[PDB]
Design a protein around this ligand. Sequence first.
Ligand SMILES: Nc1nc2c(ncn2[C@@H]2O[C@H](COP(=O)(O)OP(=O)(O)OP(=O)(O)O)[C@@H](O)[C@H]2O)c(=O)[nH]1
Ligand SMILES: Nc1ncnc2c1ncn2[C@@H]1O[C@H](COP(=O)(O)OP(=O)(O)NP(=O)(O)O)[C@@H](O)[C@H]1O
Ligand SMILES: COc1cc2c(c(OC)c1OC)-c1ccc(OC)c(=O)cc1[C@@H](NC(=O)CS)CC2
Ligand SMILES: Nc1nc2c(ncn2[C@@H]2O[C@H](COP(=O)(O)OP(=O)(O)O)[C@@H](O)[C@H]2O)c(=O)[nH]1
Ligand SMILES: [Mg+2]
Ligand SMILES: [Mg+2]
Lengths: 301, 421, 419
Amino acid sequence: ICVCVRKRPLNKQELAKKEIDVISVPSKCLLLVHEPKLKVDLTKYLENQAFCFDFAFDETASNEVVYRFTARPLVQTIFEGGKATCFAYGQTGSGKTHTMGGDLQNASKGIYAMASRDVFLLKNQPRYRNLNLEVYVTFFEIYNGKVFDLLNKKAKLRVLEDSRQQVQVVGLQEYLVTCADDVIKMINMGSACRTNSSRSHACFQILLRTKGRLHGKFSLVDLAGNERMEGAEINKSLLALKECIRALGQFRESKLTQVLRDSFIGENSRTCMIAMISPGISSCEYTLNTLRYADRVKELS
Amino acid sequence: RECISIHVGQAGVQIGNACWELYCLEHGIQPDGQMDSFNTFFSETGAGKHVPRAVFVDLEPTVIDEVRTGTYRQLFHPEQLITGKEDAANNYARGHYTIGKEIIDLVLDRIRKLADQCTGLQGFSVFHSFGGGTGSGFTSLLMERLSVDYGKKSKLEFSIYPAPQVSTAVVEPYNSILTTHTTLEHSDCAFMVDNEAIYDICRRNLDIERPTYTNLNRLIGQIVSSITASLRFDGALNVDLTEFQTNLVPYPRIHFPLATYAPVISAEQLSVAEITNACFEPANQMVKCDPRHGKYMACCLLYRGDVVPKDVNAAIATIKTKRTIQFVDWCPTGFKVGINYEPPTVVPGGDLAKVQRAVCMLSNTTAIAEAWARLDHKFDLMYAKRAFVHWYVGEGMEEGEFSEAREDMAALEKDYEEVGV
Amino acid sequence: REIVHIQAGQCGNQIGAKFWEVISDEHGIDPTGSYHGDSDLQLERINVYYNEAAGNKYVPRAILVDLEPGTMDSVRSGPFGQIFRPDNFVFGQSGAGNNWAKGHYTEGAELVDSVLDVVRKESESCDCLQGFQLTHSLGGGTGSGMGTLLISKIREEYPDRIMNTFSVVPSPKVSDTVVEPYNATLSVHQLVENTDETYCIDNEALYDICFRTLKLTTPTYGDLNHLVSATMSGVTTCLRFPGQLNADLRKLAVNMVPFPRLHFFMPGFAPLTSLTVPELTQQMFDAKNMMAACDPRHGRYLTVAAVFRGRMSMKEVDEQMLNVQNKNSSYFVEWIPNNVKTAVCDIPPRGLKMSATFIGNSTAIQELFKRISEQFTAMFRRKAFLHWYTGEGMDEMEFTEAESNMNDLVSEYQQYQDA
Ligand SMILES: Nc1nc2c(ncn2[C@@H]2O[C@H](COP(=O)(O)OP(=O)(O)OP(=O)(O)O)[C@@H](O)[C@H]2O)c(=O)[nH]1
Ligand SMILES: Nc1ncnc2c1ncn2[C@@H]1O[C@H](COP(=O)(O)OP(=O)(O)NP(=O)(O)O)[C@@H](O)[C@H]1O
Ligand SMILES: COc1cc2c(c(OC)c1OC)-c1ccc(OC)c(=O)cc1[C@@H](NC(=O)CS)CC2
Ligand SMILES: Nc1nc2c(ncn2[C@@H]2O[C@H](COP(=O)(O)OP(=O)(O)O)[C@@H](O)[C@H]2O)c(=O)[nH]1
Ligand SMILES: [Mg+2]
Ligand SMILES: [Mg+2]
């Protein structure tokens, strides 16, 4: 388990509204929140809080830099026959989709793409050549306990779970890719018909297969905002996610954790959590909420 | 000039039901109808009747229905009694959003129907429960909107802080924290009443093994009477709201003054010096805690009955000689003393007797924050596991609003402690 | 504010029939006629359980469902047979089942609409509908399979209001079918998803109470129903009677169920068979007196709700009620504050001068789910009698999908014996 935080810069709208930037990342593992506060007598002061992560990225960090220290180290895990998961977590507008899917739009500039790029590079390496693996991709979203295939026109799928308890998503479409350009075509397609704005869970998968068997799988997840009572399903999934990840380094189930169940139960499984933060003073309470959730996640490492 | 009373939800309703009855007895208004000064609270309607300037709202009939039943039935207008069929369910999220929305427009409009026959209104006195369905939810929403329709006009809340024994609900602490957050930037001054403190006073004093609501309310009635009184009689103590609060709250952070009632003694004369002496006694407070610990940043003495200042003075002198004065650094030594010659009338079949003279003492101490802690702990500890949160997310609330609210209570508890020397 | 009562499948029908005639005499109601009894209270909230028709008459807001006539005509020519509204009965005629599938798909679906369309009449007649409560068995099928269906179809037409059930979970002793575990598991899954509160009346527990502590040799379905029937009156008292609480039944839910997964209550009664107070509590908190085969010891209580009955001083009750969660203060989860609430009402039940009943959301209930999942995976292992369902249209993996959901429920309850 690896936990990171990424601060996005203030955008045009926020700068125009003269939003104050209350986030500092003085080192590669330290993030500071300059929380505005008032004493009882109305005196203004700062309660500067400190959080430490495996990696803390500032507003000047590009997606490639973020990718290098988060999902990149997990690709090898699937070639070694494991199951990896990378989650983008945070408030609405914090940068989750921008990081995983591309800037906004541009698939190539996102983690899904970059990860794919390294998967093709590794499979062609001598240590793996003799694996004779085939690369497959899937893209689906979870909305109100329902699974929808984004590569099969939002087709609603069924999720079943025997007694042995493994889960299976009936009908999910797996597409064969042999080139990064292939993957970029499936990402554009999927993102084009996704339910920008959260409301769902996005999950783009990269599977490795050899002979009827699954060699390894990497599930990249673009979570829904963490901050119409569907927020109950979102909060239950996030609560469920936390306990599943913590159970990895040692419920009250939800769809998300049910579908990704097999990626937390194995002994050869790794995960990375990236906490996105919007730097504005107006989002300070949302930030603290994101950071404290993150603390408890890494708390199991 | 004028003055609207609003009672929302069971506790709110029943409390007011009992202090609108002490009001009548004080001003001698035979339930039926008739008998300025008395005008601060009543509107001389028809060529007989006297009727209150109040509005009662609950999200189920039940409570209000008993009002349109027992005598006093005639006392109000049918309109000032709003009722709502579907219950609040016991969760702010319902009262503030789901079930409230539906009745807010009808209440909001009627209270404005009341304020319309008031040449220069003053503000609203609002009575509601802390935890409790619509007491927390609807109240919060009312206040938000009252602030929109009535800019200046002050808002004085009379809140009921919940206590384990006079039965609460498991989720109570959530509700309390929740309302007190939204509601805080919109009230001017609020009077908290600990149900444990009143249950307590009814035991040590009235000597009731099983204190009823109807038993508690009667006592609360009295505390409230003594609080308003000043601005009902009229030329006496705390005249025209404003100068009431300008006296207790030094900081915008809505400060909740601590109330202490004088001599409570069962039916079936106490010295002026003695009742004052009983005012600086923890066992007689309105919110269980103790100021021999914290500090005072504004003291108030509100007497009623036969009293000359000559004594009130010598009682204060000796009340400081062998006592825990403990006044705070940057603030005089208050003691805005107010005497209201009009004697303390009590309910006829009541449990308390007529008394020659009674005191009130409203103090804004830092030790009142000891109650903001007792609540946070309960909340914090349940929230540690999303204990019941899902019922709120269910009506359409954000898990964030739970953080964002406790987040303020963390802050308030800081401010309170920060005022110390 | 007002509740309708669905009652389906041989067990359910019999169980509820005793419930009805038991509360009816509590309120003082004749086989048809109205009031008769020097009491006055009764009538306040008689509203809640009785839609009242022509002239005096009281007629309960009850819907009767089954997939074979017999059981229904057992009621009609029985206790308070004349009391229920005639076209409120919904006959089945065709094969019963005693196989879930039949009741939740084939012979079930067949009826559903004709019942749903009668609950729809009762509901829309209600001045302000509170929710539904249904009685049925989890084993067998004409109510464990149609029932779980009926409810799957009530939510959808009524997401709004809440779903309440009294479900008899079956055992290896005192059972008519080898398949019960299949029928049971198949429903448990359904209940978890579409109900707000479910009371577990374990028949294993039930039998134990009659013979293990009541000298009653051959336990009829009779003196056994007498237990459930008395328990059910105890559990509803506060919503049908005074002016202490009022009981939104939603308030009851919001307050008893901390976690979404509808948590199942194990009930318990005070005196029994067909009382000092300290003597009454000591008993109402005893395993030997729970309505479900469990033992709160092997597990903590999430929240507890107790309701006394009869002329007695609360001064003593509040005192004893504190004295239980003290001599046993380790068994009450400490992460939920005042998690044990007690209500007292002063109108004595049948016989009994004093009485108490108990509702408990306890992680020990885990024990019960585990033991039915024990005979399930113990049969579905080498696919047992399974071909009886395969045949009615079901899929093989709809069994694993149920089993899997169910074990989680165990793996969750066992997760909350935390700190
Ligand atoms: N002092 C006092 N407290 C009361 C009274 N009635 C209820 N309470 C308290 O109020 C809190 C519960 O508030 P409720 O009035 O029942 O809640 P509500 O939503 O406003 O009313 P309902 O719609 O009936 O649920 C608890 O703290 C109770 O102890 C009363 O008459 N006097
Ligand atoms: N590091 C970054 N640099 C520049 N722009 C960014 C960055 N991160 C996010 N943005 C922009 O800010 C917005 C937030 O994007 P995304 O669309 O990334 O949010 P979420 O996905 O954070 N939001 P939501 O779907 O509401 O939960 C978009 O308009 C992005 O283009
Ligand atoms: C069906 O009628 C019932 C309805 C309710 C309650 C209950 O249990 C005592 C019932 O009896 C079974 C109830 C329950 C639970 C609580 O927490 C465990 C609570 O605090 C409170 C309660 C009951 N309310 C009170 O005790 C208010 S002072 C109201 C909801
Ligand atoms: N206590 C109670 N349980 C019963 C009764 N009848 C049956 N049961 C239990 O419930 C299970 C199924 O009940 P049954 O009515 O035959 O199923 P149906 O076809 O759905 O009506 C059986 O396995 C028994 O354990 C009853 O009369 N009272
Ligand atoms: Mg997004
Ligand atoms: Mg309420």
